[model samples]
Target chain A: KVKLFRASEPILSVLMWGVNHTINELSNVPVPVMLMPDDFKAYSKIKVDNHLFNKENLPSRFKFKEYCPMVFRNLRERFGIDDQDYQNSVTRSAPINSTRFLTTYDRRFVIKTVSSEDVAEMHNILKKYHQFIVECHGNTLLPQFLGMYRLTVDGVETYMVVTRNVFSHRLTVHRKYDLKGSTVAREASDKEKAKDLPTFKDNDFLNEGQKLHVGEESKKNFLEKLKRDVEFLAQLKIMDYSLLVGIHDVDRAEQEEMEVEERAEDEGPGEFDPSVDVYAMKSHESSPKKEVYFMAIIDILTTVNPEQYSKRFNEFMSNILT
Target chain B: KVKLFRASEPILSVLMWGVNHTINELSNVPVPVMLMPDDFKAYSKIKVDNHLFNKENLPSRFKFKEYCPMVFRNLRERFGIDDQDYQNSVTRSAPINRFLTTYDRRFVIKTVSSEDVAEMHNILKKYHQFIVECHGNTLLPQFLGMYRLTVDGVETYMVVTRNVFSHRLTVHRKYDLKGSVAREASDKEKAKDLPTFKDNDFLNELHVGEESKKNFLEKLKRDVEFLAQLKIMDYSLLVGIHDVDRAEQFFGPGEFDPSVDVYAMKSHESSPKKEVYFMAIIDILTTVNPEQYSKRFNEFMSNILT
Candidate 1:
């Protein structure tokens, strides 16, 4: 039985170990009243060498480097994220092994290993991205960027970025869409649909007669967040981002319940935790479909033309919502 | 639902959280064929601030720092320990409070003061070398990690070592022998669940076969000489006994894992009592004379088996 540190592998557990160590060390660091312009470019780097021990779930030696730690710590707070959970989410379990990137075991966050180039791009926008999160009061519709790190092993460096997952952790997304609002060949292939859950395109959404049926009140509130988020992205010249749409059919969950009716929780399977599944939206009573919708902008690190894409994306997503 | 890092408080969870992290991180670290001289003085420190999230078990903000992490990691390996299991032993469950034991009872985590941490650094280089010459065969405590944790702004320093007793078997009687005058447990102490007897008391109640005594005395003799060389004092020969019959009632006979419980020694099958004996030297960190103490300590532990 482990009472102090534990994990499935040494590499992942070390992640937990380092995150906890660094974050706790961060506590000693006084929270600056304000960050200096240099803070955006600053980082903390540590290299550890172990002679012949802890080989179970960790290498004997490695390096942990945090890029713009001051900046990310600031971002974590403005986003209403507690450092412990942020640490736990990433280190708790080996992330989802596959999917474009990785998802936390509980699916509350995503970890995507990125190219060094993307790391550079993220640095370029980090200051403004932080400002955007702060100005929005942690209520923006953009993917909530949590952390970025560079892990060095065996003389190789891999950069990674972490963000809160866009979809609800507990709410099963029956159908998904990646809407860029661009007309460039966007549709789920016959092959893509063959998977358990496929990401459809704007054309598929239009052909399938998809419309988010949240009530007018929810629609208005959501659109307001969307408009402000896109405008911020446009200002940063971050383009070709997507409105990741995930549909959770309440009716479909009921069928799943009847088949299993599993007593894991002794509660209805359709229960939605608004706190965990932050993006979930209930269907309107008058709509033909009873559903919950998860909608958020994702992958905002693009270098494509931002202003033009933002305007067109806004119009397209605005139309789909109503 | 999975338990939220089950613990009495957020601090314990942080302890669990921190170890799992450092161990895995150390895995990626490049292992030098041998440690550098500077590593004995090295430390790694970090603090965390979690504003409005994941506070179910751990405090949002806390500080964690490790002293001589590289040295400790090597010590753990020399003791034939795998970092993963070491972490699992502590984190599988909330460790018992205070000077805690890992959930598996395979390790001891003692919280010490800052000065103690400082003292560790002083003797670390010499102590590690002594361990190397001994090839990890000494009865001394194997310190795996020394750390400081800050919870609610209060910092705690801790040292972890391999438990001197079995992870599974219950110790019926124990002792902290010093081979000095006034070394007996008070009558009051003898009445507790498991009292720590001293050198004098050990002479009165101890009984062992010829081979057991001889084997123990040899190990004790060599260890004492090393202690003398270090000028360390106030150490103890921690001896623990378990009655096989009594333990069998709680668990099956021969249910223990000898590989993991490295310190345990089961009685000879023909011995009068069904028993297991564990003997190890501990508390070798005092800043006083060791040359004189070592001679007396060896004589005392050597007599216990006879």
Candidate 2:
């Protein structure tokens, strides 16, 4: 059925970084993205006149602004969260004019975006990284991704998407904590707590608690959650390990290792040592872990890689169980 | 290239069996068989007229005898056996009267009748059995096989094959001693000063000379040839072990040993305690040796498992 929808306020560019970062941070969570451009009409006009867009093979347009608000409202309603929570969290300091208008329903999504020079590159990136988007859903803690689309704006291109937000933050609690503390402490305080505890004003109180071991279970649970965060970080490291290591250096390292191994048998017994063997084994283990982490990191880094992440996660589970 | 081929001979039946068996035997050997019975006029006619014979939608007139000879001949020639060998082994036995009368070679093959049937079956059996009908350019050994025909003597069909005679005869040789008598102990035919010795019959000589040993070696060579003959017999037994065993049982008490070990494992564990195990082991061992033998046997007998 052809369903028309209303678009919400544009997702701001500054907030796009946050959204991108948030998507990257929650990279483990798979959610569909819809890139809705503000100048969708302009983009479409350019595409059509340049012969770059055939109606049958037209560039993706951001024309679903009417549906964006309804989709966003439906997602908010389904997740039992207020629409204001999303608006506040995603658009606190962002300019209204710079944002891409979009909306998300439970499983379906749409986007509206304004034309920009970056639009083509962004679209290409999203298309290329589609698999990462799907992978985010594999984590039980992550959100479900339904699907996404782009539509036209007033002569400019716009993009949007519909995705399920798995994790729902208690905005009231977050706001209460946010108002009560300094910026550094405020961010930590807004993080969901595993258990109820007395408030601490300084590092001394944390040290005292560590000394006395009071609230040990809560501490343990916190640490365990921290470990999960660490694992998430490790996954990110794996995803961007080459980037972190410097791509050229990693490439050279790999090539050298391959050459060494190729000539290893002929090099006589003492030529290769136990350390080399151990290093080789370690690299083998790390390489796969890196691949898995790359999948996870890419899911978080951009709007893609979630699908691959989910698959790798599932494969990891299966491998472990077997 | 559209190579011209005689169409009357429907070689697919036997060739199918052979190819399938060969495929199973040598898994490495890849040959595709296209049995185009639709290309033949007789097959088409038979399919249209005789509704009863048509099952699996296969043409009814595609009989084995009409086709198998050409297939065997082709395969033999492909393996580099002379055309003369093929002529002697297969073509000579084709239905002579029909072959003479029919202008078309294809028609002659298709019209093969009851009289030609027995000869065609024998030709295949002899090749498969490796009976070596001719040796040293002479038809030293004669092989025989039999088949039954329809009541009207029109349709030839295979029934059974028989053994007539083999070329070589088994023989043993020894020396005999003979000498002249001393002529009544003293008369000795006037040979006084020394005792003379005389042989009575040359055939009765005591010591065997180089000539005798040469004769023995010739016989020995024949015996070695007989051993080679025995290999072919063993191969035949192997190919049709069950049939041979059944045939052996029909003979009187002092006939062929049904439990003779033709397989290596059977020979390996030939001790008395393994007697009961012999039959099962031989059956299993037969499955491993030589690809073609095992393949054909399995093809024929796989579903007949106990």
Candidate 3:
């Protein structure tokens, strides 16, 4: 009947409330046959002050700002995600990450807290990004940006961008790498390598002789998307973006599920719905390990020569796949 | 993908938002095996203030309070009304009544006041017991929920009840019979389309055959006595008549789904007019000699039948 937006912290609760409020409000708005230039510049900002009301989980005073709502709404549609579903993903339960990065309870979405500059940069690239998403039919390897919001609490403002999580929500990534094709000092530090599921770097991946054993067709399709996405980013003079690669060992997952099943009669974990785990591709039948690989371009805000970055990034990604 | 609470006014949007919010919240709360006394006093209050937000159709700030949510939730179940359906009735579209019938015309949303809310509080426990005794078969108002909405810092109370008229069947003529003198439709009221005529106008008006009339009267008498015991008066038997023959050009004559049109009765085969009639006691809370009013109301309504 309702979304509680129940959370351990007030800011997370505000995020949930804002998303739920905006989406429901937008539902009442009529969808235009075509978006106009003005839609790109539009924003919906709400400041909330609660006086002895439902304040148990929310701050008494806060503000939520949605940047270019019409554009984001249109992008959501192009991405084949329903507004109601997106609202539920954020509000149905408290999001988990207290760090600048948070994943929705279901992990279907990743919410990354950015800076004011990031928000402004997004505003600058929004029109082109939306057009690129449209031209690619939402098939490229770039992040599927869903919504952008700025939340104000206690006179402090925080910016966040919601995107579809590149990895499977259900499958676990035993090994992950953030590859940018840059070689200089591009390796995971010993401290970075000490943590659980630490993000290894380009050198760590190449030096470890990590090769993703996707079949020919999957490789062809993935590379095609990567080439197109990187070129688009190159034309925008954007670089230093990483190709986030996550590897899920199916056999290891199956073993984990068996242990889980021993304690509780839950379902297996190795199986995944392709529609939901959009970026996951099963390893080639003859590969070294039964694995699922997730790959997508992330952090496309910095820059290098248009041709240099695109070609180099494209070559590095192609070499990683068998 | 979602119900657009699109309406012509700001108040309706708040109503839609409140209903949607409350019902969705209620859905999250597990249904108790049985309600507790504390539920009768329980309420959920939410106040929202939006700054520079999506305020096109809604006020920038508002407060919504639901009275005795669990009690109303249970009452809704007893009335065979789903929480989702009730929520949709209010929020699916801006309810049309400004005395609002849901767009589907299945329920009526009436604006009351603080006094009415107090009256409801006083009688709610007894009223609920009565409903339980009758198994939700009484002729009195089938109140579903009550709420207080604060918009622009002004508070207004409202009560929701089942529509006395059929959802699909159009009432050709209607009367609000309070069984009193000077209770007739004014000449001015008569000039408007579908004016609610009073006692004098209803000196006129039913598919109401013997068995149906017997059952209907039985419920009415039982309901009145209960009200009499509670010292409630000034209630009216709201009568709505749909002419089957007059309405037969397209949708077929006098036909109605008995389950949905709970108050409807088919005309006797030998009756002068082929029609369907909807009857229920309304304005029960706005009630004097309780017994005498009940008697006159019951007698007049009974005589109008066969």
Which of the numbered candidates is closest to the native, going by highest TM-score?
Answer: 3
lDDT of 1 by residue, A1-322 (tens): 1313455544455555566656755664567798878777666665655443445465656777777777888888887778878766766566665423878788888878888888889889887888777777888788887787777667867677888788888777888999988777688888998988888988899889878887799899998888889988888767888999988888887878766767666765556766667677888879877888889998877434778888889899889986
**TM-score of decoy 1:** 0.56
Best by DockQ: 3
Give the runs in model 1 whose Cα sits over 4 Å from its true position. Answer: A1-14, A98-100, A262-273, A303-305, B1-306
**Model 3 per-residue lDDT tens digits across residues A1-322:** 5456779888898999889878876886777798778777777766665443345577768888888888899999998899989998888788897248899999899999898888888988988999999888888789999999989889988889999999999898888999988756698888989988889998898789889998899999999999888889888858788899999988888888779988786534456887777788988889887889999999975345767978999999999898
Per-residue accuracy of model 2 over A178-275 as CA lDDT, tens digit each: 11111122222433343342223223223333121113443343333323433443444222111000001233445666798989968921122321
Q: Across residues B69-123, which tens digit of lDDT does each residue of candidate 2 receive?
A: 2233333333333434322222222222221211211111222345545344434
lDDT of 1 by residue, B115-231 (tens): 888888888998898788888887778888998888898999889988888888888888888877566888899888889887777677545667767766777777787777766
Predicted structure 2, TM vs. truth? 0.18
Deviation from native of the Cα of residue A138 in model 3, angstroms: 3.3
Query: DockQ of every model listed?
Result: 0.04, 0.00, 0.14
With candidate 1 superimposed using the best TM-score fit, by how many Å does residue A176's alpha carbon deviate from the native?
Answer: 0.2
The clash count of every prediction, one per candidate, is 45, 77, 11
Q: What is the lDDT of residue A8 in candidate 2?
A: 34
